[model samples]
Target chain A: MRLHPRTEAAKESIFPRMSGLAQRLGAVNLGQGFPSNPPPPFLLEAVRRALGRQDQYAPPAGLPALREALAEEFAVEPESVVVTSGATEALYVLLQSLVGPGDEVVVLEPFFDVYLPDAFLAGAKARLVRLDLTPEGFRLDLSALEKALTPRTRALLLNTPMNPTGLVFGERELEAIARLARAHDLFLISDEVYDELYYGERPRRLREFAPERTFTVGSAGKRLEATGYRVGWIVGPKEFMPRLAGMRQWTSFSAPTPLQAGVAEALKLARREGFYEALREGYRRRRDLLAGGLRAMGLRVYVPEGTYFLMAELPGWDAFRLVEEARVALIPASAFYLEDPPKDLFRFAFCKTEEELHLALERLGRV
Target chain B: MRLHPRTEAAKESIFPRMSGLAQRLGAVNLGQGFPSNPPPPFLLEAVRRALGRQDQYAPPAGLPALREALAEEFAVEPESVVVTSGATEALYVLLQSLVGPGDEVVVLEPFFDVYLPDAFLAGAKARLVRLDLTPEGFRLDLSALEKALTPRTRALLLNTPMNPTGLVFGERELEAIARLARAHDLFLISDEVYDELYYGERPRRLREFAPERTFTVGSAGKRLEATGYRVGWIVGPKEFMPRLAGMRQWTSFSAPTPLQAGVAEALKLARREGFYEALREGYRRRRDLLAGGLRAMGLRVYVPEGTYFLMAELPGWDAFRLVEEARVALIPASAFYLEDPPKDLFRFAFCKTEEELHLALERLGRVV
Candidate 1:
């Protein structure tokens, strides 16, 4: 049977493979970063309430009420937002539309693995720009990145409160990116899924500075801790959305209508009701606890300003085996690092409960 | 922006467009056979219960419980069934996997508009075989059908307890088609979505006779009277499903996982508790009420053996005007007929309450 080469080459999800390894070891599974805890009781109740509503098929743009609410929260017109199955799907749609064959999308290295692979699947080559956390804190390398741009660069991907490293991209870097996008005819696919999960100063959105060029993607999963909700959206100009929604229609015609209804309520609580602030404080405390635990075990740690993951360089030990002996699951940082990087680097997520983090760290000290 | 021709040429959904017309005209809608009453209260409750659970993503093959239960209900192996977003998506996946440039798919003419367009979307041509219904019921013009078959014909689309005509294909006709499929090494896409909601002796599944060649498609929507449930499945040989499923992964990953859970329970009730029998009886009663009303109006009627729709030839009448003037909505059979067909006809759905059907007939007579 004939198959599209773009789709056939997709690797079965890496998260599932890593989770399988964790299961095999019978370890305290932190390898895949899903919260093992149940969602907020209120959010689940909202889902139950939404089931009876006559929402078989909402407008292709999305449930209008939901989009209107999202618009208010993001300070954009409701028409600018495109509701998606998940942020992952939004990323897929955007790349499929803007980046045609031979087009190039630039990425800051130590990127979320899904981003580059999404570009590759869409027939676009990804240009990797390596940025590292400085001795001071994980600072964005703006000048080096500006030099990486080429005529072929269609978009620049920005993941703030970055995944794996948790380096919060600050105002300085975001402004730099905005200028670069302005200079070159480049779009910015800004991933703000971790917006409210930041530890220190909140990540500045590219949407504000460069609304014309920036496409902000966020999710209900990360904010409300309901990954199963799978409600996410693209906040971008209306003109760009037609092409993006083209890919979206064929992907999932409309997100589960019931889920969209529930997300409408959840987003209100997360953004307006101070729930986001409360959640961020909770995650920040957990991040500190995990970082302190790793330091106590004599591991060299990079302090994360935002997000809930920490990366460390372990000395003279197999990162995969270390997790097995300790009964503490860890993702080998090498998987996240494709370019020449130091060996023995491992990344661990602190998105789990404080008790689980302490227990894993205790086991890690012994190993 | 350059668009894929398939999506570019997708026909506008008639149901939604007609609903808009109903709203605009402020007419009592008999157009698009959706239930005017809310769906079953129990089914809505089932959805609420399933949604409250942490309904994570189901496997690519679909929720195992649903697939296994569907297999048992349909008398097929669990391995053969692939659950999809809707029967529409199931059809799309199968077409993508099976059809190629210049391939011919033979659809019964005055087809569910989808079959013809979808075949073309998949870069295949649709060969139409027309079936005319007699006053008694619809029968396959077997000789005409046999002549229509060509070596280029890749699959035969068999929609029984069919749409618009309200006709059930007789067992003899279905068996002959099954035999022809085997004889010609052709594929059969048996759409039995309306199979359960029929009258009299139910026809045997083509799969029961020729399971290897038949890709049987069905849905919870038609059976349960809840199209919004959005659960459908396709059953074919293990050899064919891998290709079918591979196509499905791109179109839509899977049906909403929570809905698939409820649909699994629905299949169990239909089989183990005789839920489908009771539901069929309900529709059977309504068919009698509505069909009887049309006869009373001094109209020529084609008595239906199955399905909730009836087609009658209403001549020298403007169908679009009937809805506008009479305030009782109806679709002109012109939409269903090819430009080449010689006569005028219109279709009315008998799926509504009996009282509503009588009122519609009274209004339709004066308006036409």
Candidate 2:
């Protein structure tokens, strides 16, 4: 039997293949972006405490406690929050719920890998606009984004502290994107999974500029360094969530109950203990360590303004070859781009610990 | 903003509405189907013991140990099994992966509420064929099923020891459905979540009859009374799994890691202690008790052959009205049917405890 065309297209993406190659070679594994650190002790203990009480279904929207906590974090009403299995499921459900056949969704280039396929599954065509790379960092090309909007354009998927490039779209860029979305009567799906990992001025949410039209996606996994927990949520306008909740109910009916309860408690602790600042500081130090080490080795590195990734240009070296010969795995930059991109560039994640980050940098030096 | 047409269409279904209504009224909720008893002590302990070691992503397909345990139970290769959030997700991914636009999926009517909306989400049109509601119980109307298939028909979603009506399709029916699936070149999505809840002779698997074409869906929730656990799996031909795995990866990504580990332990225990037989016996007594009590109250009750439900036809009384007046919430049987159905019929779940069952019966007696 034939596979879905979108699934076939998804196979062409090199992220998982390179990740497997890294695994086979036992490389320091900076390719896939997930934290090497354990979650906070209190969070783990919270999950343990949550065990075996209400192991049944959470309400389709999510547990009220979790939703209320997320609402408090974002300053939104609990009715607007829909806890999902992960940000992946959140985006998938949002796309499926809002976008239909003949609809067009505007996606920024160098996006997290799920966006394009998710659009395809939703029966919406994705219009890609490239983010202009400057000496400073990756910035949104506002004129190009405005030009990309058409009569069919229904939404813009904005990822701040953007994956791969690690450029958090500042207030100005976010306002411009929101303004265009408003002018065009388009929806915005802002995936801020790495919102807590910011190293610079705390990036303001796109929702602040486009509250009615934008849905902000957040990750408990990213916040707590508990990617395995798979707890994430989408907080959108109340008008839109009833449909999104319906879409969620038919898909993965609910997030695991224990994880939802644990993340609820974890979110409370993160707020109370100032964990976000500590998390930001810790990742910032790792970012400096890796970027400094890469620069010393003569690689041209774009030090991130936020998030745990740095895109480095390996002068005259092929990233795919570097993995095999150097025994270091850096995700080929082409994996993030939809079209012609710099062949020598690769994304390096610093979410690993200092020792592992140094070991990866040391291994790169061997090449 | 405009909602997807499918999502708008999905809003018409009343399963959740009735459930919410039941909650609002403080009724003895026979509306949502789940167990009132706590899960087995070993299963609960299994989950507690799986706390906090290597809580990172399970491979997109599922935990290897869990998949292996399911594989051993079904005599299938581990590679062929894809663990899902629940039978809900297993069915969703299967529909999304296999069926496509203009493809037709044949669903037996009075079906589980999920099948219709899931098909709509998959861009497939559902061809509904009614179950022959005989004195014997819910039987497959084979000729009607054969007549429903067309060139565009891509799959048949078969649920057995079926929901609502509680009918287990017999060996003759299973083979006939398999024969039609083979003849039509149709993929069979056999939802056997209630596979272990049999009240009579063990039902034959559609996969055994049509091994190459059928993807068998199973659940830990049904067997272990851990519906909240959300651990279910689909075991099919290896050829089909890679696509399902890809669909799974893009959708929910993975089930929660600790739950996957806990379920692995639970499945192993279920096997070692012969939990299936004990579970069946326990549910059997509950089913007989509920059905016997309802019949004694002069209601037309179909004693379930399997699963944890009984469909009672309340003569001269509308079930939707009965729910409001009787202070007992039953899922209206009309909610299960997509077209014209009996208005007086309602589905009563027997998964509750003895005290709850007796309480519900006493409540019904006041109405009688």
Candidate 3:
């Protein structure tokens, strides 16, 4: 049987090409953004203790304890949180619940790879607004965003400490987004997977400005350095819980149960033991080091306010060809953009260990 | 934001009501079908060992080794197997991939609850054909199924060792399904999650009868008694693997990695140690005991040939109210039907331990 046409389109993405190339070359990969470091000992121990004990179907929404723990962390009610297989599935279900055929979703350009395809899968059209680069850093083109909306627009997909670009939307920016959402009666899907990885002033969430319409998405993989864990969650107002839970039941039914239990304990420990603080400082240092090394190599790089990625300005080089020649992996910035992509830039992830970061820089130095 | 209209319809299902009722009454829960006993020691130990080491994102298709292990079991190449979160997700992805808007999928009634909603979610239409019940057991209404097919029909969702009814499709029935699939050039989504639990002659697979078009879905949860693990796989022809893998990437991406590794080890040990044989015999004994008790309680029960479930002919009773009165939970068989539901019948799960099974039967006896 032939695949659905949308599935065929998703296959054209660069992730498979980049990952396969990295595997073939044995390069110091910065293309894919999963952390190379092991998860914290406390989290590992929690998983060990949970093994074989709670390994059954979790509630369709999630385990109560995990939702409660997340509620405590996010300062939301337990009724608002729904655990998912991952941030991808969380976004997927939210989009499915909110958008339908002919509904339009407004997305910022240079977005996470999954957003557009996910919109396609939901039978919604994604209207893109570019994140124009200013001398300071990448900022949302608010006027362009305003122009993109129409009566057909039903939601906005926003990722903060945004992937590839790494610009955390601050108070002023978030308020502007909130205003648009309220004015348009649009649902806000705020992807905060990198919320804990912030380095600057912790960006105020759009939920504060538009509480009723916002669905905040977060990931255990990003916060706890366990990308393989596949545990993520979405928190919205209490009224949206049943609908979100219903969408989840039809999609994955539930996330892995014991893993949810382990993540619950880890979330508690992260807050109690300053693990979030340590991770912020740790990624902060690695970001500086990577940026410093890239600057030394005569590259103009966007210093990120948060997240593990920074964009390198490459005016004359083909980023893909450069990866092949230099034996260092970097994702082309074009992959992040939907239209009129900036070909002179590419993203570098500093989420790797210091040693791997140094090795990647050293490999790039030769080119 | 309001949910999609179809998702809103799914909320009307009886699962939430039955589950909540079971919790409130603390009833002996035969309504839900999960193993009451702990999974095998070796399987648990394997999972323990798999911890920390393999905990990460598996490939979108799945862990290569787990797929390879399943391939070995199914007598297919590794390329043909795509591991999923569970049999539920396996069916979800298959339906999403093969069927779309305006496509028709044929389903046999008194079906698994997930089938209709999954088809609706995929933007496909489900045409149901009733499984006619005879004195022997439930049999496929071949002529009815043939009548239901149209040019728009793209696939057939068939489950063997069927849920609630527990009737294994014998060779004749399976061959007939194969012939129809070939005639219509339709994809066959064969749910064989209960394949290893057969008490009668091992039912021949539709894949053997119609190799090219059949996608056989299987479950680790049913075999290993680890429903929480959410491990399952689909084996189809090599040509279908890429599309399946592509759809998987967009959906779940992959199942839990370490769990996949542990299940891989469990799959190997299950075959080597004759675990499948032992499990079949154990369930066979429980089925007999539960059926015997139900019959003695003045309930006309259809004795199952396979699976962990059986149907009781509950004429002149509202099965839901009967459960509430009896303080014993049996799923109303009406839940499985999409049209012309048999209101006087309900299903009992014998997957519970011997003591728990007897307890449910004792509670039912009081109602009689």
Candidate 4:
């Protein structure tokens, strides 16, 4: 039997290649989105209690308490929330639930790389629209997005405090996209995995404005600094929650139950203890460290609004070649696109320790 | 914006429905295949150590040592093995990797429930064949299978110690299927998730007979009695491993890394400590208790050759009504079939503890 062409081709994407190159070169990786910090001991201790007892498969939807915890945080009915293995599966489930053959999803670039493949899995096509690198910064052209939509468009996929470029959409931009979605009667699939990882004022929920049609995803893996644990939550209209939850019966069934329990506890304790603000501050400091260091080295760094990623324009150097020359590893911004890419752009992750960021800057000749 | 027909319809299947009924009625659940035992303490302790570190995403394929451990156990190349979120994802990835649009998979009836939807996910259709309930027992009717074959059949999906039926294929049956698969040039997807948990003699792997063409899946979740941990593995041809491994990026990306390490260690240690044989023996004893109790109750029980499942024919009782009457919930045998006729058969699981099985028997009434 031959391979599914779409499935086989999806593997040609970039993260794994960048990962292997970074590891083989013994470089401090500014490439992969892996978080470097250990989750708080308080959370780990909660995990121990969970591990001791939560040994069976969770309910198909999720652990009830975890869904309740997330629903409480998002101000939705618990019936409107479900836990997932991660935001990755959340997106995969959302797309599969929302779209079908000949359907098109409009996505912004540089999008999270999974956005396109996730759509492919749903038998839908992604209509790509790029956020232009303006004199101001990477900004969405509403007209460009307006042109991308057609009668066939089923949903508008979004990412904010997004990956690679770390460009958070402002209220004006978000509202404009929301208005277009409403006009088109399109579903909103908001990939807000980095929602809590933002640097400025807390990012407003798209669900706040587009509540009826918005399906919002957030990562406990991101929140707890425990990406390996594979926990995420989605809050949406109750109409879609069952369909989304039902997709898990075939994927992973549920997020690991113990991990779900720990996250349930972690969500409450972290909120009360100011973990989100502190988490935001930690990444903010790292972003500033790398952003300032890159500027000192005569590079145009796009300081992030939220996510741990920073994109810089070196104008002439190839990102792959720059990896060898700089002794630092980062993703070529080309990795995030389906369209013609800006070859001069490189995306760096500041999720590393401040020391690693310092070493990365020095390696890039911030002498 | 409407739901995809196939995607939405897949969720209306039986496991969750039976699970909900069992829970609501406070019945002893033999419905969902959730293992009743806690994972071994050694495995749990290993998990704690894994949880201490391994905080970030694992490599997209898997932890290397875990793959190596699986490879060593399966006697395949480490390159040929990749860890998955569960055997469920393992099957999902394998199907998506092998078959595309217009392809068909030849699947045995009383198949594991996911086979059809998994094929649907690949845009492939399943060609289902039934095992007639002959006087001897539930079995693979070679002629019936032969008629189901077609040119579009890209794969033959086999679940040995088959779920809901617990009918393990005999050597002759396997060889016959192997010959059919070879003659037709179809890929063999042998879902041996219950591979190690067998009785009488250990199940001979289909990979042994058709190593080149067969992709065999096994579950550390099943082996360690920790299905919640979500660690399973696929061992197949090197050609397909990379393609299979690549599918994870859009799924769960990787199995939980710490759990992967724990399972790696558990796999090695379990073999050294003779866990599989003991695991099989324990299930065998429970099977006897439940199968004997059903027989003693004057029902026609298809004594399982292996696996935690046993099928009993009560002739007239509705399985859902049986759940309420016996306070012991089970799946209907009808749930396993695509071309179905049997409504009198009920599938009981012996995965529960001896005490639970004993209590279920008492609740079922041995002299019914």
Tell me the TM-score of model 1.
0.80
In the predicted model 3, the residue pairs found to clash are: A56-B228, A228-B56, A228-B57
- Candidate 1's displacement at residue A16, Å, is 3.6
User: What digit string (tens of lDDT, one per residue) describes model 1 on residues A284-317?
Assistant: 7887888888888787888887777888877777
Encode model 3's per-residue lDDT on B211-270: one tens digit a residue: 999999998888898877778889999887777877767666778877888889999999
lDDT of 1 by residue, B201-220 (tens): 97777787788888888877
Using TM-score as the yardstick, the better of models 1 and 2 is 2
Native-structure RMSD, model 2: 2.0
Cα deviation of B245 in candidate 1 (Å)? 5.3
On residues A34-106, what C-alpha lDDT tens digit does candidate 2 reach at each position?
Answer: 7776678888888777766766666778888999999998898998999888898999998887787899999
The ten-residue window of minimal lDDT in model 3 chain B covers: B8-17
Q: What is the lDDT of residue B207 in candidate 4?
A: 80
Q: Which candidate should be chosen as best, given DockQ against the real structure?
A: 4
Q: What DockQ do you compute for every candidate structure?
A: 0.20, 0.55, 0.55, 0.68
| Deviation from native of the Cα of residue A243 in model 2, angstroms | 0.8
Q: Compared with the true structure, what per-residue lDDT tens digits does model 2 show for residues B1-368?
A: 67767677445236556666777887787877777766788886776666657576667788878888888988888989988878889999888877888899999888898998898888789999988787666777788989999999999998987897788888898889889888878898999999988888988888999999889998888778877677888999998786787787778777777778888888888878988889899888888899889889987888888889889887777656767888788877678898789657888888888988898899889988
* Candidate 3, DockQ score (0 to 1): 0.55
| Candidate 4 per-residue lDDT over residues A5-27, each given as its tens digit | 86645474477677778788788
Span of ten consecutive residues with least summed lDDT in model 2 chain B: B9-18
lDDT for each candidate structure: 0.71, 0.82, 0.83, 0.82
Clashes of 4: 0
